[model samples]
Target: LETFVGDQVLEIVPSNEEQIKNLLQLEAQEHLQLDFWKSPTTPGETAHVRVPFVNVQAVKVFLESQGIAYSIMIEDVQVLLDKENEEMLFNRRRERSGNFNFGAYHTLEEISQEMDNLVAEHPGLVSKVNIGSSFENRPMNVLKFSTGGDKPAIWLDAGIHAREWVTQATALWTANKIVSDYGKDPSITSILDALDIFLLPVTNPDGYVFSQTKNRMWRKTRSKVSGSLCVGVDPNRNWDAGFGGPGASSNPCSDSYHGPSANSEVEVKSIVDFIKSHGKVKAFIILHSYSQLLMFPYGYKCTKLDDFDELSEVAQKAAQSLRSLHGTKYKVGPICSVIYQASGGSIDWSYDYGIKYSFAFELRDTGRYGFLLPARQILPTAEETWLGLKAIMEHVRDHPY
Candidate 1:
């Protein structure tokens, strides 16, 4: 890993994307489906070729062996190779708005600074607060977007799971979207008038920073145990939804790694305290990625939830909007129905706290991409997701369920 990080994160060459794309396209010509991203794609597409996760040494060795041109993002643990003649390729992607490109991955500090700037630049409508700090004491911010009235509130939390970087973009974009068309866009005005949107773009600041700095794939909050030597905790499963048990682990090193106890981590406690303090949150939505599915309630176990029927009905209404595109197929239902079960999840916790309509959206690349979503696909992904989110808001406004 260290060797590969020698240049990937810091030294991005402008032509790297084109070079990598050409390589993969040629591989395809030879009937080899290249797996560029670290997603769980089946082998048939890539000629059963699974891109191996190699440390820095292995990466350097692979490059030497294959004799491929490469560009590295030097500051962090990321590496991209450019070789159109090679059997496989890798690339780094970013999200953008008009001429203002929001880079692909943002550190915790960058996210916080961006929020601060937005709030400062767009006063009256935007308000930012540092609710608490992470285990390592990094700032955890809560941004509220209002329409100059004391309306009821809605909470939207994203980037709770680190690798879902696009979630942060979505959170930020939604905020800007509302402000940009405040009076002009009735849809935005209607929602803003009815609900003050409280958004947390980067929930687990420490883990997010660590992911960009040490490990791009890191997915937990930095938590220091008394004796054990693990560095982080899965903030999503640290909630009090089902506490500790199945679907959550006591072992600190495990991914989906549950901590020693509920609210044990400061970040979890901070979020819980924030929610409890603001009891007016009528709707709660947690944004995640890769599955292209919308889930609600009952993450720990598969038992039928109290609001399963209602949740399913609303999710389907939104899914229909997502289905408008020809090749895009997405599902909406309980987490267990579409994906694996998880305990102490934020979505389930919100539902337990009386937030009637709670949903977790796993966004984009149902098959083509997963965690390693490309930069070119960011707008389309957010555009589709924005539609689904709008549908949900409209449904809630009309049905009141």
Candidate 2:
């Protein structure tokens, strides 16, 4: 992670419509590095944006020059990041294998190794499958847990965006929970008996490893965008749903940069191929982090989906189930409405293709920690998310499509 020693994260709230317009203009410029972590997105609502410490002066000048309202959320972003790393180190000391070690974050190596250990430990229930290879030739592995029939399968994938550490951690915890509780925990056992569960803990292995070894906030697949100096494409936005549509950028330098072409990234194509070949997938859940939301299809546009009511009801119930554990409230709705419109997303593609119960989970804190969520909350976050996943799966089992 780049050390932001003198850097601060300021939260800006545009005072009026005119100020909002000015802020939007500032956001479009790359020189300011104005990172809009959260925004009103819709009209008449206040915007919540963050800019680097180095760029704070420029942001202040622009906001003040326009008479806009703003506040500093973190005087030094590094302090929180440093503190989070320290806590992770301390927790790692006690994170020995066996039952959910939700105290520390695992590296890409540790996650892959844990999959081997899991399959070895539960040979009868969990079997490891080689899905495909990533851009860097790392094996993309998935753990398949089944109770032996031609049951409808539910797919769960995490770590699509490298920075979302909690998603992968939660996926690993969920995998362990399934193995440890099967035939023991009635709810888990019931799901296992009726449906096959496919869990891909680390979706983008190359980028994930890159994040651990290089940048902590890297969010794209580690692949070269042809003819461009920038070396990655937003894998989530490389799908075929709305290839180069709105909410995605065509610029190679952008974080949300859609690839040169649809299914351009191998990591995304691997997932696409797997889903297309696996015909029995009834539910597809893609896990992401930072935003506490339970969202469903049509990220390309704000149109009504066929099974909107059923999906909305289940999402509400899942959010309720999630809230019951520690009261972590998650807003539920269509992705375009709940969060921002994000085209070429995995869930949107999955839902459009066939899976009626497709959903994307934005887990944990709304924005306090952002991508740097502390290790102490891993288990709590995973525990609640598990409940939410089970809620969705149960709903799918009863009401398929």
Candidate 3:
């Protein structure tokens, strides 16, 4: 399938719930890819939306007809995408940095190799485990950082969405930081002493490779659904918690497709099985990109969790820690309230499955660069995100579930 340029991103200020309904109706009818960047969780709140070139006219027409106020965020999304590709290519051509450099993005193969190398270098601290296989039979590997203790663990995974390159980058950098700074950083040492850390940098290997080689915006696993031409399902929306609910699409061609059934995608099932078997996972964190948010569970619905106050406090502390590093502001709250109602999300499943500290970190740029975050910003994003993750871990260390 070929793609077109000049797709515009628009931020709409919905004055009323009716206008919000109108925009969503247009989204469904026109097959528009809506990235509810800022969702209207309450009355008088605005919603930031994005649409492809094919539906720009339809979206704009609906907005105008509904008398909704809006502004264009990106006039030509393809141009920015092209620039992103150009910079990535240039960075790849330059001298390859080591795994801990944090200044460059690595390919799926390079990331896997780096994981193996890290494990080899620090045999006492890092050990690699093959949790499961992706749809394409690619090994789903996770690096476990343990100090030979029967302690609670912090499980973190990234690259569940293929196009979110910065996510995998940050996960890798944080993994390396855990090993290199374990003894040097007091906070890191204490966390390691009390709990183990398991990092899965590339949770969807097949889709990630496809994103790099085929489509730049692919956001699902490369699994073929029977009776459909679409080749993938959104792994994030393929979980069992509130599966097939709101915030997910049933259409096979949609990016947020919830799949034919819960855990239908092998990549998702792989992680799900691994986490369930672990049994002692105290915290589960999923990493994503393009939006600056630190969200907890209950993404499938609008209801708050029982431990909402504790989750909110930890999230606020993490966000504040992140902002302290680089002044990057991050919104903190439940996923539905903070962004939109996303069903079958990993955090929701993990939270329901008994991990009280489950959360999702949407790293870096609010929208200036969107998913195509520059390689130059990679280190800063990783640095700040590490602080946020560390903040969460410190909280976990202090207060045991």
Per-residue C-alpha lDDT of model 2 across residues 1-401, encoded as one tens digit per residue: 46667666566665566776677667667567666666446544445555676677877887787777777766776787788778766666656544435557877776777789889989999999888899999998989999887878999999999989999999999998888889888888888888999999999998888877777768898887668888889899989998799888887877778988999988888888988888889999999987798999988999879999989999999999989989888889998988667789988899989899989999877767777788888989998898999899888777654
In the range 78-168, model 3's lDDT, one tens digit per residue, is: 7877777787677776645622345787788778878888899999999998988988999989999998868889999999999889999
Give stretches of model 3 more than 4 Å off: 1-4, 30-50, 54-58, 96-101
What lDDT does model 3 reach? 0.84
Residue-wise C-alpha lDDT for candidate 1, range 199-313, written one tens digit per residue: 8888877777775666656677878877887767888888888888666667665565678888888987988898898777788888887667888888787888887787788
lDDT, candidates in the order shown:
0.66, 0.83, 0.84
Best by TM-score: 2
- Alpha-carbon lDDT of model 1: 0.66
TM-score of 1: 0.76
